[PDB]
Each structure stands twice: as C-alpha cells, then as structure tokens.
C-alpha cells in the first residue's frame, strides 16, 4: 500500500506531465497521495496562470464577511457578519491597515503560534466565495475555469444526463481569515490555486480517519451536534492542532505559497488560515473514484447548510432515499 502513514505529498510535474489533468490526478493517487486528504502541486517553471496581477483592483467583493469567533482559543465557532461592498483595491488597503495587518513574526511556525493564541480576539474580514476566474483564457494547462464538469463525469460513469453547472470561485483573504473544518459538498475533490500574496496554512485529516474527527467534534460542540447529525457541513467549527494532538486525532499540516496548487481528496477534512492579504481560486471536481464517496456522503437536512443548485441532482441520483428529507432542508 502506497503512503501508508498518510503523509502530505508534494509533486513537481514537468511541462509535459502538466498537459493532461485527469491523468496526473490518477498518477498522484497511484503514489498514495489521496491517503493524506491533501496534496501540493508545484507547477513547471515554464507555466503561468496569467501575465500580471496589475489590473485586479476593480473586482467587487459584494458581501465581505466579518468572521466573529465564540469559544476558547483552541475550540471555537465562527459566524459571518455581512459588511458593505468594497472593491479588491479597497479590501487590500484594509488588509494592510494597522488594525488588520500581519504582525511581526520570525517564521511560519511563530505565525502559526500567534494565530492559535490570538485568533478569537479579533474579527478579520474575508472576501470569500466570489464567482469568477483569474486564469487567462489562453492558459491551457490547469486552468480551473476549463476543467471537465462534475455533471459530465456523472454522465460518463453512470449514463444519466443531469442539469447543473460547475464554475470557480475567488477568495480574497487577510491575516487570520479562517476556513472551518469541512469536507467538500458531496465529498467531492477540490483544487485551489493561490494566485498572489501571502501564504495559506492547511490542516487535514486522512479520509480513512475522518470519523475520528467527527466523534471529537460531537464531544466538543455538544449543542451543535444535537441540532444536526452532520453539523460540520455548516462550516463553522475550529479545533486547534494542540487539541487534536491531545485527543489522538491523526492529522497533518502544510503551508501553501503563491503560485502553488493544493488538491483536497474525497472525504479529506480540512481547515486553515491566511497569513495576510492574498487571492485564491478554487473549484470542485470529480473522478471515477469519487462516485462511491458521493453515494455515502453525509448530509445536513436541518436547514443550515444551504448549498448550490447543482447539488440537487447529485443527491437525487446518488442518494435517492435521502432526497426528500434533504430537499425539505433546502426549502
Ligand atoms: O481557501 C479557503 O478559504 C478554503 N478553501 C477550501 O476549502 C478548498 O479549496 O477546498
Ligand atoms: Mg479590476
Ligand atoms: Ni474545502
Ligand atoms: Zn445542519
């Protein structure tokens, strides 16, 4: 069995290996990369996502989200308070202000310590979940707006044509902006490219151990757990590495820098934080190996998780028994 300790693997494809996206994902899996839940892909030195980032300041962040925490430093929830619209140039200036900027630090490890110690005492503002793309249309390799669609994959594997579309999303971050512990909708893959700016730190639980993280979360968030049998779908709960280690939960950590891709694999729980002003692009995708995870994915039916139009068909075809109850949650 390849990668039996479930370590995060890092790949360096050549420009020739970078042509065929599906083939390269299958290669990484042949080496055991999925067992970690997360892999890093460093693009060939010849590749670029676009020529420059000099002309992005006029993108609008229609609904910036202020991330307000409750709890204790290693075990907390966050809610999102909607703020007034602002442009990317306005948001960059805000990120660089004395109130919001990254503090002085020695290295990534010192910054990680300061994040876990201090996050709860501040409410950073995240420009998350913005439909769009920063890849140039002429970039042919690993262009997240030109991938094979999940609907087309389900059709190729299962023979059923379904409605729905699959487009990328932009994330503009600042120091301390946070992504809570989650897997993807329908336990899909995700791919995330860090276009510019400061790093993003990731934590991940191997898929084979995901239920250990769920059982800890039910213990640590006991009211949430009574409210919903899949409350991590709400994407609100944070648990620190120190707390995970104290409770024996297997995990790994890695920092992504500008110009690097990360792939999350089906049922790989992940969480993390941004080091300073940055922009990332991400999209979900599927492979044949996903189908069995999609059939078994948990679902939130309490009404909180509220998701895209395109998830309807995935539930309806892959999970027909659950369909009725899940749709009640969505309406
Ligand atoms: O970058 C972020 O805030 C969150 N991203 C992801 O969870 C992802 O790409 O799967
Ligand atoms: Mg612009
Ligand atoms: Ni994710
Ligand atoms: Zn729920």
From Swiss-Prot:
Cofactor note: Binds 1 Fe(2+) ion per subunit.
Top-level lineage group: Eukaryota
EC number: 1.14.11.66
Gene expressing this chain: KDM4D
Cofactor: Fe(2+)
Compartmental location: Nucleus
Source organism of the structure: Homo sapiens (Human)
Record-stated family: Belongs to the JHDM3 histone demethylase family.
rRNA-binding recorded as keyword: no
One GO molecular-function entry: damaged DNA binding
Modification after translation (UniProt): Ubiquitinated via 'Lys-63'-linked ubiquitin chains. Deubiquitinated by USP14 with the help of TRIM14 leading to stabilization.
Function, in words: Histone demethylase that specifically demethylates 'Lys-9' of histone H3, thereby playing a central role in histone code. Does not demethylate histone H3 'Lys-4', H3 'Lys-27', H3 'Lys-36' nor H4 'Lys-20'. Demethylates both di- and trimethylated H3 'Lys-9' residue, while it has no activity on monomethylated residues. Demethylation of Lys residue generates formaldehyde and succinate.
Reaction it catalyzes: N(6),N(6),N(6)-trimethyl-L-lysyl(9)-[histone H3] + 2 2-oxoglutarate + 2 O2 = N(6)-methyl-L-lysyl(9)-[histone H3] + 2 formaldehyde + 2 succinate + 2 CO2
UniProt KW keywords: ADP-ribosylation, Chromatin regulator, Dioxygenase, Iron, Metal-binding, Nucleus, Oxidoreductase, Transcription, Transcription regulation, Ubl conjugation, Zinc
Protein name (database record): Lysine-specific demethylase 4D
Residues that bear PolyADP-ribosyl glutamic acid: 16-17
Major localisation: nucleus
GO CC annotation terms, alphabetical: blood microparticle; chromatin; nucleoplasm; nucleus; pericentric heterochromatin; site of double-strand break
Residue ranges crossing the lipid bilayer per the database entry: none
